[PDB]
Amino acid sequence: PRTPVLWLHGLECTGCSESFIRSAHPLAKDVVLSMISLDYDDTLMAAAGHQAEAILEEIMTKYKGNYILAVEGNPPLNQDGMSCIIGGRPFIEQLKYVAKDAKAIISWGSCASWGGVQAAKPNPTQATPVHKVITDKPIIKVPGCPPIAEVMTGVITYMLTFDRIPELDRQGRPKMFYSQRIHDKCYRRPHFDAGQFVEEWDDESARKGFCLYKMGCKGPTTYNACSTTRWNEGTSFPIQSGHGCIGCSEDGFWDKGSFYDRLTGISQF
Amino acid sequence: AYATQGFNLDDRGRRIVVDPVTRIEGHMRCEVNVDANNVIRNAVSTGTMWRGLEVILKGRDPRDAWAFVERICGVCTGCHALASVRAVENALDIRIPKNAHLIREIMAKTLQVHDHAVHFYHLHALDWVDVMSALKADPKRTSELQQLVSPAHPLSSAGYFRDIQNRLKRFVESGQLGPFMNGYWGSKAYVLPPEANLMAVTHYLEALDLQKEWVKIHTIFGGKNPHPNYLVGGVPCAINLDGASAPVNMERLSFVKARIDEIIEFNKNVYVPDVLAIGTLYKQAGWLYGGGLAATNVLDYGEYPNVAYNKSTDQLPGGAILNGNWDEVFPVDPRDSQQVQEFVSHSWYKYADESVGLHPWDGVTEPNYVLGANTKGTRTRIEQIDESAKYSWIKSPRWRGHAMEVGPLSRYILAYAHARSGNKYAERPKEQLEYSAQMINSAIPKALGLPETQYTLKQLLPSTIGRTLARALESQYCGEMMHSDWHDLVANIRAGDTATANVDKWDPATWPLQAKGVGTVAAPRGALGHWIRIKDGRIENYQCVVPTTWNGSPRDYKGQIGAFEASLMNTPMVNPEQPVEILRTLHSFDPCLACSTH
Ligand code: NFU
Ligand code: SF4
Ligand code: SF4
Ligand code: F3S
Ligand SMILES: [Mg+2]
Numbered sequence: 001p002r003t004p005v006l007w008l009h010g011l012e013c014t015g016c017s018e019s020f021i022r023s024a025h026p027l028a029k030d031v032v033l034s035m036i037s038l039d040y041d042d043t044l045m046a047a048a049g050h051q052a053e054a055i056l057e058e059i060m061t062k063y064k065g066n067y068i069l070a071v072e073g074n075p076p077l078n079q080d081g082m083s084c085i086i087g088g089r090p091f092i093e094q095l096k097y098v099a100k101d102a103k104a105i106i107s108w109g110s111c112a113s114w115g116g117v118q119a120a121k122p123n124p125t126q127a128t129p130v131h132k133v134i135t136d137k138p139i140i141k142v143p144g145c146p147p148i149a150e151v152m153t154g155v156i157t158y159m160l161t162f163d164r165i166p167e168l169d170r171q172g173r174p175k176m177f178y179s180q181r182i183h184d185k186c187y188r189r190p191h192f193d194a195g196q197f198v199e200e201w202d203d204e205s206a207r208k209g210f211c212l213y214k215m216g217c218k219g220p221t222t223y224n225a226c227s228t229t230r231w232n233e234g235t236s237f238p239i240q241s242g243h244g245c246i247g248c249s250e251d252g253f254w255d256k257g258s259f260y261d262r263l264t265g266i267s268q269f
Numbered sequence: 270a271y272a273t274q275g276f277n278l279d280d281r282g283r284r285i286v287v288d289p290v291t292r293i294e295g296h297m298r299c300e301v302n303v304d305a306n307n308v309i310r311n312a313v314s315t316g317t318m319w320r321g322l323e324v325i326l327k328g329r330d331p332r333d334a335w336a337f338v339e340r341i342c343g344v345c346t347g348c349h350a351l352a353s354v355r356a357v358e359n360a361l362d363i364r365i366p367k368n369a370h371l372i373r374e375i376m377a378k379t380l381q382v383h384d385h386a387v388h389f390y391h392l393h394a395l396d397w398v399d400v401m402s403a404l405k406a407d408p409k410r411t412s413e414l415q416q417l418v419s420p421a422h423p424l425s426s427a428g429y430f431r432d433i434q435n436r437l438k439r440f441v442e443s444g445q446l447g448p449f450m451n452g453y454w455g456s457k458a459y460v461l462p463p464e465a466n467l468m469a470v471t472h473y474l475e476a477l478d479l480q481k482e483w484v485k486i487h488t489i490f491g492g493k494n495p496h497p498n499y500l501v502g503g504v505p506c507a508i509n510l511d512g513a514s515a516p517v518n519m520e521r522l523s524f525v526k527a528r529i530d531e532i533i534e535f536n537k538n539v540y541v542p543d544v545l546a547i548g549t550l551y552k553q554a555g556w557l558y559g560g561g562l563a564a565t566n567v568l569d570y571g572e573y574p575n576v577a578y579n580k581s582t583d584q585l586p587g588g589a590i591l592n593g594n595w596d597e598v599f600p601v602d603p604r605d606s607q608q609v610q611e612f613v614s615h616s617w618y619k620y621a622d623e624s625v626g627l628h629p630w631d632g633v634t635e636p637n638y639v640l641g642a643n644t645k646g647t648r649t650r651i652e653q654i655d656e657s658a659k660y661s662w663i664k665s666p667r668w669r670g671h672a673m674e675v676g677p678l679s680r681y682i683l684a685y686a687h688a689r690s691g692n693k694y695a696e697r698p699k700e701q702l703e704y705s706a707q708m709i710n711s712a713i714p715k716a717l718g719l720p721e722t723q724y725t726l727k728q729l730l731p732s733t734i735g736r737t738l739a740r741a742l743e744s745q746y747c748g749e750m751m752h753s754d755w756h757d758l759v760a761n762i763r764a765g766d767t768a769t770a771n772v773d774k775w776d777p778a779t780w781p782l783q784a785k786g787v788g789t790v791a792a793p794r795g796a797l798g799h800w801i802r803i804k805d806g807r808i809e810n811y812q813c814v815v816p817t818t819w820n821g822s823p824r825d826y827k828g829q830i831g832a833f834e835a836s837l838m839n840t841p842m843v844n845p846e847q848p849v850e851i852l853r854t855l856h857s858f859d860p861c862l863a864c865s866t867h
Pocket of ligand 2: 011012013014015016017072073108109110111112116117144145146147340343495
């Protein structure tokens, strides 16, 4: 009897859903068929309209306090919540209704975790992260824009195997994935350590894989698994492909100035 | 009740609501009215989300814009980044080096294939395929069907199909049907035989496993997928063959090539044949509904020039067709204030004058959530949306005042027209369409022992089947094109050109204190544009008009309906409270609602 997952979508770009299905270990096919029961997820579910609505009532009843609520995106508080409408009603109402009987709540990505691109200034919809709306339930934050596929399924696999939320840091993120900064194990560190930096795009330094600090890399202040686990079954990561980290797993990264402005106080790193 | 574009709109019949519309990206509500015979006589497309990226962008650095607007959508991920860097480059008069152009083309074409294939199998297929019928299919005949539908596809044996069938059986017999829960299985709207059903559900699973490999091309050039990195002035993935420490080397390019070769195989052996087969069978059942505006008015900006910065060499050549006249393609200029314009007469925004449409350089995005007096329900609990007033978060783009359909179908109709006019750059799409028509009309019916038909492309393409067909054909063509781009890239690098970025105008001190730019992209769902105004190094205005904005649009000032609403008209429903036909047709546009509203 597989654990039900109700996957809700607020204001979002659907990139977290897409990242999830890229997972190789385990395959998304194997999680959906053999590990979880993915009963509500507007991206892939057969039913629509009233028939889709009816699913939520059914699984909350039968599996009360034994389903996981996964949330992608977030609720807006402006426009009376109607900048995200589901079933003719504000998304925040659906969020609160499904959350109340969930065993655990997963905030997928930077949107759900922290506010995301829509909460960047001046935040016209007053998009608000899940944990600032649901205050009485256990929430695990899985940030990143989107998070790595294997981090997403890795959280799921852990919760399914042990029936527990993994150990979280102060900000509510799982330590098994977010304990290191990109800068800790970045393969370009030796260059940083010797003061070997790219100064302009495609200069000689860039062609030698020199550190991207002076091009704005936010790896020194960004917690994620990108430098070790890496992306799309370990194929690359932003820095390996030549662009600095933009800090996409961190709270409010859209409003920490230009992505190409270097961090100040290089001595601290 | 009123008439518009040859459609007799009438809201006197039974109102039916579909909210949420599922198996799309983002959030949509659809309402229709049907007559005494369950024929849709009115259709209302409501975009039910908004985030305000255009507002968020104000005052920011143009060089950072791509990353913001990339997060408009993680499905068509990177097409917005492409539009943005093109718009800034256009504003600042920046020419990117040849390698950067080719890498962007390869990234664009990889997105096309991934997006198209995943859409058909994982979002669209369940409108055509009964999964429960697949359970009671004979494994043997399915192998036989597989050999006729695609002889070259080596996963054909009966055990393999039995094995797949059994996992499905055990799955459903658990009582936890997951994504198949409360499905419309057994509707008479499904016409496929068990064997075709099992064949498709099998490819659904194959595509689900394979799709994750294809995007590794994005990962190599752009670091991650979803949301690979882009760059104003070129690409960040600097090149060095030998002279392991650089983003791009020969080994990385060989990897890219191997993925491209796999794509070409999937497209020609799995995706295109399935759609041809499924299309044939639904054509045989007489389900040629859903043409909507495709029968009259189609548009694309035109894309994929085989020589950079020369639009006459576009391999998917664009323009606009009006009134079903495929002998005259009007040129489309995104800079012309009198061509692309957006209205908000029936959208939840406000202008200083809502009787006019604004060209996006003059675009305005001030939210205005207000419901009409004929609304049933309340502001926070809608039962029946009032389409006579403002009813969507989607703006209403038009071209010289005309309502247009955009997307792969529009591009393939435009390519057909261009090719008949003498345009040689569109030969491949033309040959794809004629080959497809001949398969759908004659070859596949003969192989399955069905009667032959004689539909012309004119009759066949303006249909939900045609719209689905065009998407699969476009995936194939894109795979073939990036195969060529890959060789051109490797050739250029070997000749000695390793350049990947033009940084002459990277620093804002070199910029004009005021400038405007536009970037266009043939995104998976149709015609995408970003229009930017730059002032004192900051974004003064940034406006996006996105393909689903075109297709999903509500009515304009004149009351003209958009592509979604038109495509639902004149469609019979087997059962009014099962939205099978609504979903089949809406999904044939591949609705991206986060895109539409951004
Ligand atoms: N294709 C696509 Fe997006 Ni998710 C749309 N519509 C676009 O630019
Ligand atoms: S976190 Fe990023 S990828 Fe996930 S929904 Fe939000 S904008 Fe998209
Ligand atoms: S600054 Fe960025 S590129 Fe340089 S070592 Fe740290 S994480 Fe790596
Ligand atoms: S931009 Fe995001 S994907 Fe990893 S390298 Fe930085 S945290
Ligand atoms: Mg817009």
